Amino acid sequence: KRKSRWDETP
């Protein structure tokens, strides 16, 4: 359950 890429900024 590594954090998803959703809402990841540049």
Added chain:
Amino acid sequence: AMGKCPTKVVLLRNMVGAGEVDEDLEVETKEECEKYGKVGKCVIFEIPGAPDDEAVRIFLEFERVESAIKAVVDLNGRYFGGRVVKACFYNLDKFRVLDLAEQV
């Protein structure tokens, strides 16, 4: 303008670049989108020779058009892995015959 007309099928673009569809992309996509409603099917197709912010297309077919509308409003303009996601609708009948490279 196909992309503006609500259907059960959501098209996500700019999620990842050309040649960048990793082994976790589909599950990461699917399991987030299930928060808008039940997802029936997911197809990822990369359009040969297309630009990098447009080559990879991720299709989610929802069970309800209401869930699909929720998805587009929330996912359009949203960040995914540093990229601004483009979210819109896709023609159901074209999707069902895998005509997947139409202008939206």
